[PDB]
Amino acid sequence: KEIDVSYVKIEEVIGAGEFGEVCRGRLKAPGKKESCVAIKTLKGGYTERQRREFLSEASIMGQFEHPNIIRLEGVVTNSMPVMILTEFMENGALDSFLRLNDGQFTVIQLVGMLRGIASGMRYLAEMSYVHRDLAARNILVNSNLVCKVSDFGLSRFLEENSSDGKIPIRWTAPEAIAFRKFTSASDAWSYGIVMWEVMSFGERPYWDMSNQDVINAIEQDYRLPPPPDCPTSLHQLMLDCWQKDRNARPRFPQVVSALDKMIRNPASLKIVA
Template identity: 75%
Template sequence: MIITEYMENGSLDAFLRKNDGRFTVIQLVGILRGIASGMKYLSDMSYVHRDLAARNILVNSNLVCKVSDFGMSRVLEDDPEAAYTTRGGKIPIRWTAPEAIAYRKFTSASDVWSYGVVMWEVMSYGERPYWDMSNQDVIKAIDEGYRLPPPMDCPVALHQLMLDCWQRERADRPKFGQIVNMLDKLIRNPNTLKRTGGETAVRPSTTLLEPGSPEAASSSVGTVEDWLQAIGMEKYRDNFTAAGYTSPEAVVHMTQDCCRPSQKGSFSPRL
């Protein structure tokens, strides 16, 4: 048996889902700072966690978060898609760095990758990373350069920190001490948290494109309808369909010359 501190609010993933949308950005950053501080403590002592995820974070009544390690077996039993079985055991694919999946190379740097996914979980209030993509699709997507888009209303600075944690080369990822310092700066300067990307956390299409290309901008949206909804223009769905714009790839290549107001004053794509 093991005796641990009583944490009134239980595991972080369930707590976030129960309280969707109820916290300020500063409160969420405070949660992230606590987790990073705990991981800094472990990494400074040369411990590698290997299963850092919101399910393994405990929350007390004051929103103080502490790192634990008891949830994986429960989640794997309840959700067979949560892990990928190898000869070396089960790996929680959605939270695991590429080198740990491919070569079972677990280090503090692979924990940093996992921390980036925890950040995404916190800012999306416990949404499932990579949605309903299969394990193999997640592995393939990551290998081709895909990274999770910012959750709704996520500050740009926080999503950039996530992307830093998801650098392909582990040496390029920040250390936990650096992450704590970055979060401290954001907390001291809350204005830096006001700028958001204005993007919603919509799932990627099955075709994953090279990051940075014009097509990649639309690849995070599965359908034209999803894209229109994401930018608040869902009422023009029939206009796009009638004009033949039925795929995100077709929309990407639209220009200002392709579009004009219709005679009734509503938007209408021009072929």
């Protein structure tokens, strides 16, 4: 939906994306209370393919409604700069939010975050939407610590296209890297890496290993070890997500069910390696 630019006030530049700035501001439309929004801008000097690539993210988001998927408020297209407005997530990207708060949230809180991400993914899979870039950097966190999935776009990765973005190797399931077969099952592998990011308070998956070191290690049966203090039951769910055979990995409803069980039985989280 097209938003009248008079309805929008931009307050502060809070980040950068691929095509421009990310800002915090305020949306106020006739008949509605004023709300806080995030605003992605696309200023002059862009091509129309890029304009449509930019705006595709809004088209896709506008197809979804779920409490763990970032909500679109609208777009500004008949004015400059071109804008996408979403709900504002006050704590920003999860990886950096966790590094900032290293060791400061309880296991139960971290499992609740992971449950939120899994529910988002459960919804997307149900919608037959394959995310392809599921990583803690793409999870946004509000002031109540509710985690929501973000980063929507359907553009092939560069390796999928003419001979003459790149695949996020560290998050990507082996068959997806080898064959570019991206499915909800390859998203479940990425979710496993996200679990590890969360329980490690935002450490980089595979530390300093090169992308090709990662590819080889995984092919040769290596899997990330439990982060420090990580409950064994969470690490095992990670290992389930990391099965080489994609059909053996848990589907997202099963992932959510497993996390809900943990939350109902928090004593089980006390078993650590």
